[PDB]
Amino acid sequence: IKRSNVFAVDSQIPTLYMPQYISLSGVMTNDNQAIASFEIRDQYITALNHLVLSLELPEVKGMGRFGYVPYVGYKCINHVSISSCNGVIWEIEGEELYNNCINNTIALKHSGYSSELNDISIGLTPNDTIKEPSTVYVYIKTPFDVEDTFSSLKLSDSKITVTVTFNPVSDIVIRDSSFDFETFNKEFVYVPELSFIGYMVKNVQIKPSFIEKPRRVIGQINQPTATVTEVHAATSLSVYTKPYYGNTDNKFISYPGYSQDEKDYIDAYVSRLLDDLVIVSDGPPTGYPESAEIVEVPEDGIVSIQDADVYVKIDNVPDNMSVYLHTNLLMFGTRKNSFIYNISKKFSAITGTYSDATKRTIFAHISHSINIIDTSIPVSLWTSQRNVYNGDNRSAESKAKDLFINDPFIKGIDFKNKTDIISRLEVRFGNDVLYSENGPISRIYNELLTKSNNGTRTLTFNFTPKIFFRPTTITANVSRGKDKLSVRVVYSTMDVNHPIYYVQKQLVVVCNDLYKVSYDQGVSITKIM
Amino acid sequence: IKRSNVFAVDSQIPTLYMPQYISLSGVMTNDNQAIASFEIRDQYITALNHLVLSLELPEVKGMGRFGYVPYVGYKCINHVSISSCNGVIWEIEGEELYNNCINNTIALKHSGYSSELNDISIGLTPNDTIKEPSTVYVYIKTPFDVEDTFSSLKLSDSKITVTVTFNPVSDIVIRDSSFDFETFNKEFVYVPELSFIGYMVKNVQIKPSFIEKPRRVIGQINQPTATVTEVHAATSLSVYTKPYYGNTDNKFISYPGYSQDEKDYIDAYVSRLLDDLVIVSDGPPTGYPESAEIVEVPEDGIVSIQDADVYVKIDNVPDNMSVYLHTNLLMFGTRKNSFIYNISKKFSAITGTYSDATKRTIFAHISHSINIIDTSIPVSLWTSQRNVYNGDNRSAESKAKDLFINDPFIKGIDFKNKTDIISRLEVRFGNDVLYSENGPISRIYNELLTKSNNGTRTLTFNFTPKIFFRPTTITANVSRGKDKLSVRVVYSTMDVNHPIYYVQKQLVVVCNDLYKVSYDQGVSITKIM
Amino acid sequence: IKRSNVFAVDSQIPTLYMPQYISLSGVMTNDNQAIASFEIRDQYITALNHLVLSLELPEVKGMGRFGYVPYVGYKCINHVSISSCNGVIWEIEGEELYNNCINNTIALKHSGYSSELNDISIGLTPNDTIKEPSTVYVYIKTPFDVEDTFSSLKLSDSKITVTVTFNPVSDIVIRDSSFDFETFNKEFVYVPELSFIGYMVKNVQIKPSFIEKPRRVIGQINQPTATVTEVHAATSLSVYTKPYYGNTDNKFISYPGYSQDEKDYIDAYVSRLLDDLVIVSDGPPTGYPESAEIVEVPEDGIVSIQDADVYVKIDNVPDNMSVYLHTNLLMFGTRKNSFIYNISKKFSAITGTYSDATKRTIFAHISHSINIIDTSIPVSLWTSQRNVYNGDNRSAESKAKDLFINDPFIKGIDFKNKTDIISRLEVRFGNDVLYSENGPISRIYNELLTKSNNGTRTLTFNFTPKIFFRPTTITANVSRGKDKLSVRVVYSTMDVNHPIYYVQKQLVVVCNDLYKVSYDQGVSITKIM
């Protein structure tokens, strides 16, 4: 019995090298999209990987409510490209980069995720500081990071250029109307610095490698189809939907800030609704539109709103004041005398205590049925032409606290991507059906295999180890016409009298193509056919 | 100096294959245990792994309090078996499957763990919907998943059958007496679908492999011994205890629902006790049994309960009402005039405010010594024959809110498996002592080595990589009689006047046997001797 | 096309061995530092790894406030050394051991991290039990654990000695002045037990290996320089700063106990300040020093404190009482009529309700600007000679609740190591500059590469797999004088009128040297040159 020794190893002497952390400042150029270019030319840098982008956010002064989106560093990136003299080596969109890093909690934390950055801070005077200057770090995960020095990008005596395109500053900022965003936008400038790990290698022996490069296709608005052409060697395919808020002003009622659980979203929304829902006043409350229906709460504390009973009990109400309930705070309906969507009927029990000192109701326990979709409705959709009612019956004070939100990486139709609006998915390679499903079993598989919490519907064709094998791909057959991937979905049917039915959707299809990387005459890549 | 190249690899071309996600519907057969069978016969399916079971839970309508246990998908599974024409290939119990997946947070989340499923929802009218229809996904982790395609189950032109046995629906449901469980049970049916990843391989070269199959032995009620016979090649051995609630009605006072921390359990329990503990009333409170001792709280706010001082201060008590304290809410004792277990003496400070509108006391800060064992006591044990007192002096209203809980995967004597009731463990291989310990150092080691939070006392005999080596086992010596593993424990001594002393216990011993998998004449396994 | 089989393996038969868990009691010897020695001499133990130290903490009785620091098991360890007959094989400081385990959440949990151990418990009578006896487990991670049996420490027929030096018990205890620490210290004794996994190997074939041993250098108080000499083969270098609280009594105002978030620290601090900040009294509040400035809150609820407006609104104040605000609770300043640091001016809105029953103010919402540095100020620094004011104007009651905290593993100048006090870092190998940076990009890299949340500024020179290659090092050139590593930093500039400016700092430099491990004539190590 010849036995393999599992208590000792014969240590290999590795290639002689020395690593170094290297920072570079960029050249910035500019609706004038901001672009940073970083030039890497150094004869003693043989390979590199682990790119990190530094961004200095400035001091924010003035009046209004201002905050940064979570993961602001990732969300300010529109596009990243690595090139040489022979053309582009590897590139990615900001959405797909953020997708690839969504499971790296450390990287997400470094890119800007804290109370200081992401709470909605309030400025009271034109000289009040709303945010202090800060620095975020964006880990640009590339295929050259999977196996450390084995997968690194070798600079075969070539000059490597890294180009970063930035999103407009309105994408990364949550603000109210009181904040002077025009001035802020005129003054804001991205200040980037690029870092990487370089390797000074002694007598490097270079071999050709393989690289996967994502390619992204967005369908037209509300179409259930998208197609990616010229597919010859794909390792994976993923499909998801994005909301198109272009038909709105991008104003929402609430945003939970640094708290990012579904419960947190719902709590912020309910908190914003309670100030206009239950009113302690001397006589009929004033300052609400004519369409508002404010009723007094009887001695039994129960108000009926057409099949719905709301239980209101407030402590310490003065003897000259009564408790009032808003029975149609937000209303939606497409036909005049049919079903109505009423945000007031989603409450069952409201208790609290009136404060004589601050003249407010401090709410204690609330029983309600608000979900994430309601927190995700845009304010424009409550008052669209299709609504036969006056949708928004809130006070002017609460109307003034709505927030502009322009986050570019939102999936689905809600902030959490919690509702699945795809009820059937079909993929075709050429004309034949490659995959079909009704439930999200492919998303279950993507999450199980990548150990992620925010998976998408994904067909993965590669199950081999990463760089020590050539990746397994679905291969084209141009003779039989199998050279394109077509995706058709069936959207989940929503009620025509729910405002979320009118959020516009786009289908996104991402394809990972296989490329050969060769190192004769500098660095170059060729698409595998 | 010959140096190993650590900056380049020679990529191997792997076996030509194509993966595919495959779903199957089953054949259901039926105290009529429900059994689902899934048949896999497909000539182009060469291998498979990554089994996922889909379960559609129906709409739940009616009155009462209803909820699902956490991880309902895992808890509805009694047994899973994979077979071919030559017999069983691999099988497992539901408890051990859940044990093997306890460290996979993604899988646990997919099997049904959310507020919507696990809050105890309340139905008010016979047409109220308590739960909406939902789908859970149970990842059935098999030994064929450890190394992706290397460890996959090859179908040597054989038909593979997957059989799932389900637990009764009462195991996965938390309910009160007001819910119509008889009708619910008559109507509930499991609707399962089986998914796996199949591989269509071109010219597969098959080699024999090794597989570990768990074998489970449960000792008799309250015996400190269990033995597993016919042990010839075990890779690991684990020991834990389970509570036997068969001598009870399985009714508990509280359950925290979706919150699953120890603090959450304790908070739910204290919340259920406070409504009968402190009473604001006009005169001596009514509606309590004769054995209740309700005393008025003096001006200093301190009530003495035999060496115990409780500090009660309630704000806003009306002038016609007084504050009362329940001094023997739950009581236990075995001898008439000796030590008594009194749930009231476990409180030291109770403060709150009376609400005139809702006629309740809203409690603020509470100081207490309630632990997890108290939340884990069954209501039947408070009123057993051995209790010389009337144990339960609660109001009928609170008595009506007790929950039936029949969770099948509970370890220890509390819901969290927090108390260790094993004070000494001894394992014998044959007649010789193989292992001995007093503290839980083997559980510490199991958690450290498996990177788990819910480890058990485990002897692992294998420290070699998984599939690239033959596993290391403890080998039998039938000549010397070393062919069985005997386990004897010494239970921690509990006080005879604590009700948890009378919870019945079973010892569970799990043994992982090594099997050879061969592929001539289809798939077959043979026990290593 | 020769294809590598990725669906089958040729299983290797490994070395024949049998593992066993082994516990040992020690020999304890003793300002009399406690030292435990464990002797391992057993002919059938061929290798070992995975050391775990058991510690029994006793019952704590008496009066006062008492608690254990988080991770008490790690914090009681001063030094660990593994030796043979040829000298020390491997050793480490307690700080660096805890650093190496900071990312192992399971190990941190096992070493003592729970509400029961880490809440500040209160003893009321001299016989009250503050803490029950408990056992913690400290995983002593060694280089012999990285690759299981491949990296294990082989005992070439040698006797191995493990020696543990313990910190004084005052390092692991958080206490007030009311606790009798002199008696506690006279009675406390460490009771340790050592566990490891031993391997009984049949015909072991031993080969020489490599090991990295940390070496630690602490700079002098407040010097921005430190140097590690005799550096010939280092795999990594890390730099951080520690606070020196020797010029204080080590008393702080608050400690959050088991809650260990920054928000938790701030909340505990604000809670301790509110009792003296806002006072509901009949007339000017009494019991405060003469330097206190207590003003009555006007009808509009706004008090001005030199450019700062505090909004105070308390409900249910009796008609004979008024609301008062402490305008200089904690004050600091170095010049008589210049800038002042006033803890009262860091509040903007204070609301709450007075309780007539308990005669206290129960605070509801608070708006403030307290940060982690304020919670990290020592009480001695408020009343130093450099303060031209009476710094601490709190009541005697709150002064009596300050806690002694002597935690030995604190980094930076705050409890969370959140503020970076290093604005520039430079490393020199010999006289040449090896590395330079202004921001913490090296800490970003350390966290990204080690997947940690508490990284330090680190230069790592090794990117090769751990034990199957010889590690890559930065190599000395004694001819050119490159045989020492010098570190110089520039500290962040703090305001001279902030008390945190006067916390003393030490620079810590840790170097990982490469050693050869050989097994002829027992175990021995030699420093690589």
Numbering used by the authors:
A (entry chain A), B (entry chain C), C (entry chain B): 16 to 45, 49 to 547
Text from the published report:
During its cytoplasmic replication, vaccinia virus assembles non-infectious spherical immature virions (IV) coated by a viral D13 lattice. The characteristic dimensions and shape of the crescents are determined and maintained by the D13 scaffolding viral protein, which forms trimers that assemble into a hexameric lattice coating the outer surface of these membranes. In vitro structural analysis of recombinant D13 reveals it has a double-jelly-roll structure composed of 8 antiparallel β-strands that self assembles into a honeycomb lattice of pseudohexagonal trimers. During this maturation process, the D13 honeycomb lattice is lost, and a biconcave viral core, containing the viral genome, assembles inside the IV.
Given the clear lattices present on the IV surface in our tomograms, we analysed the structure of the D13 lattice in situ by STA. We obtained maps by averaging surface sectors revealing hexamers of trimer arrangements with a lattice spacing of 133 Å, in agreement with lattices described for in vitro assembled D13 and deep-etch EM honeycombs. We found that the D13 lattices coating IV have a similar architecture to the D13 lattices formed in vitro. From the hexagonal packing of D13 in the subtomogram average, we estimate that approximately 5,300 D13 trimers will cover the surface of a spherical IV. The packing density and radius of the D13 lattice on IV are compatible with an icosahedrally symmetric architecture with a triangulation number (T) in the neighbourhood of 268. We have not confirmed the presence of icosahedral symmetry, which would require pentameric arrangements of D13 trimers, such as those that have been identified in vitro. Finally, we observed a gap of approximately 5.6 nm between the innermost surface of the D13 lattice and the membrane of the IV. This gap cannot be explained by any unresolved N- or C-terminal residues of D13 and must therefore be bridged by another protein such as A17. Analysis of tomograms in 3D, however, reveals that a proportion of IV despite being closed and fully coated by D13 have a single invagination of the viral membrane. This suggests that the D13 lattice is flexible and can accommodate both positive and negative curvatures present on virions with invaginations. Furthermore, Hyun and colleagues produced D13 spherical IV-like particles with a similar diameter to the D13-coated IV we imaged in situ. This strongly suggests that the D13 lattice, which initially curves open membranes and eventually forms closed particles, determines both the size and shape of the IV.
